[PDB]
Design a protein around this ligand. Structure first.
Ligand SMILES: CC(C)CCC[C@@H](C)[C@H]1CC[C@H]2[C@@H]3CC=C4C[C@@H](OC(=O)CCC(=O)O)CC[C@]4(C)[C@H]3CC[C@]12C
Lengths: 39, 158, 37, 34
């Protein structure tokens, strides 16, 4: 067909968001590191 | 339920920012990758009406104003974020109508398709149908969030 | 075929759910850490 | 390739779900003790 890569749009947009999630993991872990260090 | 919605009010704007940015991404990949003159205006009614662009702008604007009105609690951000959520609910309802109409047009197109890979038009119509389905899901999330922001900032004023 | 696209779409929906939940948790930890500071 | 690219990416999603379920219990554990 020469339009198959459009269905590569969906997992790529997943591997952006999941990548965002690991930033949203780290930025949630460090602010939970700085909230247990204070106690 | 006033505090039970105020605790998640900022998230309820962040979901609008997320839905708007995914609307921008879907609109820019449809605008760039697709040769839209090779496909029907019934199939591309999502892009022909321009809903990813003017829905992305309004969702990002209303979600950003919801984030700022939570973070600053300013009497000018409120009634500006409330009006942004009024126009975001109007944009989301118009988007829901446009996406349901495009689902109907895609169903009428894919009636004349023996398989998803029958030709290029059948595949692009199925890809647009998938993208319409997961913009209908995201528009339902953005509409429910905008309606909840409207309920919170209207019952606050009661 | 259609199965890989369906699984891909449900994985994208899974990504939407996880990024909404991480955004919820991010604003919750930010509120809890801006309340203590 | 989509099957391997989604099999590794479901694993990258189960990992993020596990870290969300690991962070949420710690948040509620700190919320129990003020
Ligand atoms: C093409 C699409 C898939 C990408 C767009 C998704 C993300 C780039 C954006 C959409 C909305 C963003 C969220 C909007 C608002 C917030 C609040 C924000 O708050 C702060 O800035 C914290 C400040 C501090 O840590 O001091 C933290 C990031 C977050 C969750 C953002 C995380 C990144 C998100 C998910």
């Amino acid at each position: 067909i020469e339009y198959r890569w459009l269905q590569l749009i969906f997992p790529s947009l997943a591997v952006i968001l999941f990548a965002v999630d690991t930033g949203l993991w780290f930025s949630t872990h460090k602010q939970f590191e700085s909230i247990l260090k204070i106690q | 339920w006033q505090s039970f919605l105020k605790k998640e009010l900022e998230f309820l704007g962040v979901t609008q920012v997320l839905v708007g940015l995914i609307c921008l991404c879907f609109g820019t990949v449809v605008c760039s990758t697709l040769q839209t003159s090779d496909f029907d205006d019934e199939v591309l009614l999502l892009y022909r009406a321009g809903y990813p662009f003017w829905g992305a702008v309004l969702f990002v604007l209303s979600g950003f104003l919801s984030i700022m009105s939570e973070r600053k609690n300013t009497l000018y951000l409120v009634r500006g974020s409330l009006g942004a959520n009024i126009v975001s609910s109007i944009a989301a309802g118009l988007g829901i109508a446009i996406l349901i109409l495009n689902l109907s047009n895609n169903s009428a197109y894919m009636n004349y398709c023996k398989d998803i890979t029958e030709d290029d038009g059948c595949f692009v119509t199925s890809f647009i149908t998938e993208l319409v389905l997961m913009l209908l899901f995201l528009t339902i999330l953005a509409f429910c969030s905008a309606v909840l922001l409207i309920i919170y900032r209207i019952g606050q004023e009661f | 075929p259609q199965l890989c696209y369906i699984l891909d779409a449900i994985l994208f929906l899974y990504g939407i759910v996880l990024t909404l939940l991480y955004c919820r948790l991010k604003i919750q930890v930010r509120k809890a850490d801006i309340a203590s500071r």
